Design an enzyme around this catalytic site. Structure first.
Site, mmCIF file in Angstrom:
data_model
loop_
_atom_site.group_PDB
_atom_site.id
_atom_site.type_symbol
_atom_site.label_atom_id
_atom_site.label_comp_id
_atom_site.label_asym_id
_atom_site.label_seq_id
_atom_site.Cartn_x
_atom_site.Cartn_y
_atom_site.Cartn_z
ATOM 1 N N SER A 178 0.836 -1.209 0.000
ATOM 2 C CA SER A 178 0.000 0.000 0.000
ATOM 3 C C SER A 178 0.864 1.249 0.000
ATOM 4 O O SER A 178 1.723 1.354 -0.891
ATOM 5 C CB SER A 178 -0.991 -0.123 1.176
ATOM 6 O OG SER A 178 -1.673 -1.370 0.992
ATOM 7 N N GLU A 294 -9.435 -4.909 -5.054
ATOM 8 C CA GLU A 294 -9.163 -4.301 -3.757
ATOM 9 C C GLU A 294 -10.078 -3.127 -3.450
ATOM 10 O O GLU A 294 -10.404 -2.904 -2.289
ATOM 11 C CB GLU A 294 -7.688 -3.870 -3.695
ATOM 12 C CG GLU A 294 -7.401 -3.284 -2.299
ATOM 13 C CD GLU A 294 -5.971 -2.824 -2.133
ATOM 14 O OE1 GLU A 294 -5.123 -3.226 -2.937
ATOM 15 O OE2 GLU A 294 -5.689 -2.061 -1.190
ATOM 16 N N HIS A 376 -6.193 -1.822 2.213
ATOM 17 C CA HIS A 376 -6.854 -3.105 2.178
ATOM 18 C C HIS A 376 -6.122 -4.143 1.353
ATOM 19 O O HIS A 376 -6.753 -5.032 0.771
ATOM 20 C CB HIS A 376 -8.275 -2.907 1.614
ATOM 21 C CG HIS A 376 -8.869 -1.710 2.298
ATOM 22 N ND1 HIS A 376 -10.204 -1.589 2.597
ATOM 23 C CD2 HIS A 376 -8.278 -0.587 2.748
ATOM 24 C CE1 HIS A 376 -10.428 -0.432 3.203
ATOM 25 N NE2 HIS A 376 -9.283 0.193 3.301
#
Length: 463
Positions: A178, A294, A376
């Site tokens: 991320s 995602e 996530h």
């Protein structure tokens, strides 16, 4: 065996599960008081043996101290054996997190791979990414990218000192998920990081993720300074405001503020993906991938996406990631949020992979399809083989399945760090390198396998 000497002095770690760990090592001078909003400076040396058996504080965050520039090391042995070094940069949207999270515990990597693992803290949110431009003078011109300079500072510490902990400074692989992967994408582009690492892995992010233009970042800064009661140019109040009030002011803006690196002309002189096309990272192999679908997971932290009617929805998506060509709409909340998945995650991954392949570098691409409970990204516990940790959504059911996917990913990541190739008998079939020619990707699932150009149809709809 626990005491190691570094350029700054000796540190005492501990034995843990048959491996050695050193916690809370300072890699830079604390950026407090008059060092607030300034690039990181080398740490002070000490005499005697400094304890390294407790984590240091995390950096300021909603969750902490401005004094939080620490790193942590796991190693099978502090000797001279030149093991691969895995340097992890955590995610958390450039807002929260830390290298001391149990989720990133390096024990399993170190034990199973005979590698050294390093996890770090870096400044975040208003302390690490407050773009000030020249509004407070030339000394603060880098302020919008301090968290990136912190990461570079930690990587310089590791190149200078990791040999003493059993690691090879010439075999460092940087990796992150991320915002951590966005960080890896930035570092890949950065002249002043070139030669500090040998390989990179990007999990569910790329250099485009959370990236800001100067115009965009300055507007956010104006709103934050208003909330903080700081007039533009008042350096006295910029340095004397309590860290908690400054943090509160920012967070009081909610979503009309996002943090991340800024193409400011000083640390970041151009888009980090576009730089790869000009050979910024020509000799650097990468392993890169995404979590399937995602953006559907973002409805958990932002259900408002689900409330909107089709029209409102599409106008929203258009404002955030548009314009959306008609051909894309034709290819295409569940259906329309696929546009957000493609624009935020898939496109930057494909642009990164295409740039490196055009430079002749090896590229290994994946898609993670395994359904597992919740920017996530979902790979992390399998990659770290940390299924057993706290904070990990360890729920009953599926145990042999989860172990099996962990055994595929953990050992592929270890093989890539060791040799630059994720292949071996831990995979049910070979993982071919991504080339313009075939655009192969490995798909991690209950039955892992290779797909040819799985993103192609979507990508053609757009491009």
């Amino acid at each position: 065996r626990t005491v190691v000497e570094t350029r700054y002095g000796r540190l005492r770690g501990e034995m843990n599960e048959g491996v050695f760990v050193w916690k809370g090592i300072p890699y830079a001078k604390a950026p407090v008081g008059e060092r607030r909003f300034l690039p990181p400076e080398p740490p002070d040396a000490w005499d005697g043996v400094r304890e390294a058996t407790s984590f240091g504080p995390v950096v300021m965050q909603p969750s902490p101290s401005e004094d939080g520039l620490y790193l942590n090391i796991w190693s099978p042995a502090a000797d001279g054996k030149k093991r691969p070094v895995l340097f992890w940069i955590h995610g958390g949207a450039f807002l929260f997190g830390s290298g001391s999270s149990p989720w990133y515990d390096g024990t399993a990597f170190a034990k199973h791979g005979d590698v050294v693992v390093v996890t770090i803290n870096y400044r975040m949110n208003v302390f690490g990414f407050l773009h000030l431009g020249d509004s407070f003078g030339e000394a603060y011109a880098q302020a919008g990218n301090l968290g990136i300079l912190d990461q570079v500072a930690a990587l310089r510490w590791v190149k200078e000192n990791i040999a003493a902990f059993g690691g090879d400074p010439d075999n460092i692989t940087i990796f992150g998920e991320s915002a951590g992967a966005a960080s890896v994408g930035v570092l890949l582009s950065l002249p002043e990081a070139s030669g500090l690492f040998r390989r990179a892995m990007l999990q569910s992010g790329s250099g485009s993720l959370l990236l800001r233009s100067p115009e965009t970042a300055m507007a956010m800064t104006e709103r934050i300074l208003d909330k903080a009661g700081i007039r533009p140019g008042d350096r006295e109040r910029l340095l004397s405001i309590p860290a908690e009030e400054l943090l509160r002011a920012a967070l009081s803006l909610g979503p009309g503020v996002m943090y991340g690196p800024v193409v400011d002309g000083r640390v970041l002189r151009r888009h980090p993906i576009e730089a790869l096309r000009y050979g910024a990272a020509s000799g650097i192999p990468i392993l890169i991938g995404v979590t399937k679908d995602e953006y559907n997971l973002f409805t958990l932290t932002d259900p408002s996406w689900t409330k909107l009617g089709e029209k409102e929805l599409l106008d929203r998506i258009n404002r955030e990631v548009g314009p959306v060509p008609e051909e894309a709409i034709r290819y295409y909340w569940q259906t329309w949020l696929r546009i957000m998945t493609y624009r935020v995650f898939v496109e930057g991954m494909l642009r990164t992979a295409d740039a490196q392949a055009a430079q002749g570098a090896d590229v290994y691409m994946y898609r993670f399809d395994y359904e597992t409970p919740v920017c996530h990204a979902l790979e992390l516990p399998f990659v770290f083989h940390n299924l057993h940790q706290p904070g990990v959504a360890n729920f009953v059911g599926n145990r042999p399945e989860r172990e099996a996917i962990a055994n595929e990913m953990h050992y592929a990541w270890l093989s890539f760090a060791r040799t630059g190739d994720p292949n071996g008998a831990h995979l049910p079939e070979a993982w071919p390198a991504y080339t313009n020619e075939r655009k192969a990707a490995f798909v991690f699932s209950a039955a892992s396998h290779v797909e040819d150009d799985p993103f192609g149809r979507e990508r053609a709809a757009w491009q």
